JSON list of C-alpha atoms in Angstrom, two decimals:
[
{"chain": "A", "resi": 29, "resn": "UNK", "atom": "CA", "xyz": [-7.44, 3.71, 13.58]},
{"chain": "A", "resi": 30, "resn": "UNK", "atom": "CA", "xyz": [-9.93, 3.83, 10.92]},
{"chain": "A", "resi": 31, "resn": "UNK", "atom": "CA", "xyz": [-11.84, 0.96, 12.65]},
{"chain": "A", "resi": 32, "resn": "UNK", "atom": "CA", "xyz": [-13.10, 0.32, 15.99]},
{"chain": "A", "resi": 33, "resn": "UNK", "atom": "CA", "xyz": [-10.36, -1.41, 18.65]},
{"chain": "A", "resi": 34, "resn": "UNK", "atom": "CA", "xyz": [-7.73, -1.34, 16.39]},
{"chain": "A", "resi": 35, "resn": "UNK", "atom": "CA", "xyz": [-3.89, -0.28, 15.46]},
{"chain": "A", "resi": 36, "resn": "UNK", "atom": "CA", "xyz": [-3.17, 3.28, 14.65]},
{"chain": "A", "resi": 37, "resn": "UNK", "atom": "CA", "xyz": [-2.17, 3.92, 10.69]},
{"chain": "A", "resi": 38, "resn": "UNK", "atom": "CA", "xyz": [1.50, 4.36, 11.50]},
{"chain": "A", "resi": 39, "resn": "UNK", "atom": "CA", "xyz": [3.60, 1.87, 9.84]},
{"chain": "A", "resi": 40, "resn": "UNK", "atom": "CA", "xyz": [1.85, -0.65, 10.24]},
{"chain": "A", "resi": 41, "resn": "UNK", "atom": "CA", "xyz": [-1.54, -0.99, 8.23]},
{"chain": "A", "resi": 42, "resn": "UNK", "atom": "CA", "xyz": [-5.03, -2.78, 9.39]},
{"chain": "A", "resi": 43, "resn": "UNK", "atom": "CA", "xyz": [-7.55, -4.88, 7.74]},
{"chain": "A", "resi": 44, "resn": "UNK", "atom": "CA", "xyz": [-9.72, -2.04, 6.08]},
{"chain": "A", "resi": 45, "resn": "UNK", "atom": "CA", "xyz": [-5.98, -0.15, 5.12]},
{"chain": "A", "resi": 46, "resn": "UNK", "atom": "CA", "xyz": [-4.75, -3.29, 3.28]},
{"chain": "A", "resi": 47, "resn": "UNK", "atom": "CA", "xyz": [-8.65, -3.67, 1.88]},
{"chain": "A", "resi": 48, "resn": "UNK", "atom": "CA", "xyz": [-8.07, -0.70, -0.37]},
{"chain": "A", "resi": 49, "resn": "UNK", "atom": "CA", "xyz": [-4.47, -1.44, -1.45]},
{"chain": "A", "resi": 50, "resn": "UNK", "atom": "CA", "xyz": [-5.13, -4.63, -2.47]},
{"chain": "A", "resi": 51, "resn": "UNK", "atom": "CA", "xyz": [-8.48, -3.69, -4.51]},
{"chain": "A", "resi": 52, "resn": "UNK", "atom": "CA", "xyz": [-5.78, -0.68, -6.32]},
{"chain": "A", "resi": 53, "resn": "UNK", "atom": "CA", "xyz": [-3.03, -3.69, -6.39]},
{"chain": "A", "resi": 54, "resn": "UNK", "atom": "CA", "xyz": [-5.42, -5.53, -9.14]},
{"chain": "A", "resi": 55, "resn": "UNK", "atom": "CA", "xyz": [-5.73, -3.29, -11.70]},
{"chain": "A", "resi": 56, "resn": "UNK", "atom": "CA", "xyz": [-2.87, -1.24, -11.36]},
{"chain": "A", "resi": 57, "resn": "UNK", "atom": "CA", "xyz": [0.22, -2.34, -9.44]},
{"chain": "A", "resi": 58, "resn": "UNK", "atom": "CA", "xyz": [2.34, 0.56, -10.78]},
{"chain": "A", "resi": 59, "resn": "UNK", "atom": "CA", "xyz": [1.38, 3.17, -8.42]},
{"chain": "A", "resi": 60, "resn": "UNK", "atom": "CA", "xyz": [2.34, 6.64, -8.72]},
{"chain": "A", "resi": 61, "resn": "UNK", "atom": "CA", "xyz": [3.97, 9.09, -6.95]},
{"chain": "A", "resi": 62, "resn": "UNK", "atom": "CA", "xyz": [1.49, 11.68, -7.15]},
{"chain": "A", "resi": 63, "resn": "UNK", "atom": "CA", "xyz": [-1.34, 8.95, -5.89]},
{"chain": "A", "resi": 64, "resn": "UNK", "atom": "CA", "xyz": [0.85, 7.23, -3.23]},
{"chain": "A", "resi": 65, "resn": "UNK", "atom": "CA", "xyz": [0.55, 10.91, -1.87]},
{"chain": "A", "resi": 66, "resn": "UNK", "atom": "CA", "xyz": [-3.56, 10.80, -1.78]},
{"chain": "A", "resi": 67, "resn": "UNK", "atom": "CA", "xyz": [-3.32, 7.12, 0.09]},
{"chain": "A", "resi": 68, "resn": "UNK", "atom": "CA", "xyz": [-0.47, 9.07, 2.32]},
{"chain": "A", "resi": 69, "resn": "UNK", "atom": "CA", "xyz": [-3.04, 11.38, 3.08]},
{"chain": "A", "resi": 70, "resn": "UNK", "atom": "CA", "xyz": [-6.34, 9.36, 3.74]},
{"chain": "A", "resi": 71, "resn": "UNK", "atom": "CA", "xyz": [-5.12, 5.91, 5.48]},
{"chain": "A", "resi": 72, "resn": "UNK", "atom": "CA", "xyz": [-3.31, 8.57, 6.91]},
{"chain": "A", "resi": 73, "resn": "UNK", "atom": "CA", "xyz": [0.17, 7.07, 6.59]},
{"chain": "A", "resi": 74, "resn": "UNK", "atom": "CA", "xyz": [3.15, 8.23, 5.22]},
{"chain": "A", "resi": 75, "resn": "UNK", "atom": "CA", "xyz": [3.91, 7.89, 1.52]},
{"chain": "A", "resi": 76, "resn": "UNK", "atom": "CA", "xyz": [7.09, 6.16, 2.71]},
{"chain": "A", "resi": 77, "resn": "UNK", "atom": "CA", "xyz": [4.91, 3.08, 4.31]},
{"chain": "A", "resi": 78, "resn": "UNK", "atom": "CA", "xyz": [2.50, 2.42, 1.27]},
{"chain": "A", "resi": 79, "resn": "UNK", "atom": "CA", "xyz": [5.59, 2.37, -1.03]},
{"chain": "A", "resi": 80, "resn": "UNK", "atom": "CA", "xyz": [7.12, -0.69, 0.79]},
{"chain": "A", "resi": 81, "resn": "UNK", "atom": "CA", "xyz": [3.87, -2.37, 0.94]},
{"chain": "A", "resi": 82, "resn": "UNK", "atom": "CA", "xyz": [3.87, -2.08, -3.30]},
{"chain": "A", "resi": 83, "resn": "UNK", "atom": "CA", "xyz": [7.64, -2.91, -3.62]},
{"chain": "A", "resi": 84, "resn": "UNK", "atom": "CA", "xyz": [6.95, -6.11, -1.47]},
{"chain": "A", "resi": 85, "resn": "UNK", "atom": "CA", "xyz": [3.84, -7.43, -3.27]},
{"chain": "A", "resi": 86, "resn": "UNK", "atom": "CA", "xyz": [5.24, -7.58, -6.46]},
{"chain": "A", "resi": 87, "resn": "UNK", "atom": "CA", "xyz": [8.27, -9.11, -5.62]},
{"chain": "A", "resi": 88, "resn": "UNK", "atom": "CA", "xyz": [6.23, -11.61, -4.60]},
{"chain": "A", "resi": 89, "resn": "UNK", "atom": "CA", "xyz": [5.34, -12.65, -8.50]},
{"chain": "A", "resi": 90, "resn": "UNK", "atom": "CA", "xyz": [7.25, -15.19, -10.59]},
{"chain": "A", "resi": 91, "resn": "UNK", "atom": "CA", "xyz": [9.37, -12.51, -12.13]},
{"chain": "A", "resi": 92, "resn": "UNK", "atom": "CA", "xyz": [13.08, -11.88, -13.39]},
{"chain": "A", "resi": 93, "resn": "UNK", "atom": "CA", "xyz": [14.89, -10.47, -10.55]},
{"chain": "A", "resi": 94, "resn": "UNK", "atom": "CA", "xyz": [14.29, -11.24, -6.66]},
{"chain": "A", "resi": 95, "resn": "UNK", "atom": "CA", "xyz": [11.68, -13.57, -7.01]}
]
């Protein structure tokens, strides 16, 4: 992966992968489509994978539904 002895960027993310979501996550949690795609592309995951990881984050908030 994109560090030395690491996992591959399948599903499953490493510590520089979740580094750069996290740093997005701050300012903008609403992620797009269209820039899901790009992170898709350069992690080089899936779009499907990165989408979960957003979905899961903010349910993690004191909101209405879920949590």
């Amino acid at each position: 992966g994109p560090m030395a002895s690491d996992k591959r960027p399948r599903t499953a993310f490493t510590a520089e992968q979740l580094q750069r979501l996290k740093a997005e996550f701050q300012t903008n949690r609403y992620l797009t489509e269209q820039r899901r795609q790009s992170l898709a592309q350069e992690l080089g995951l899936n779009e499907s994978q990165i989408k979960i990881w957003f979905q899961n984050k903010r349910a993690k908030i004191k909101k209405a539904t879920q949590a």
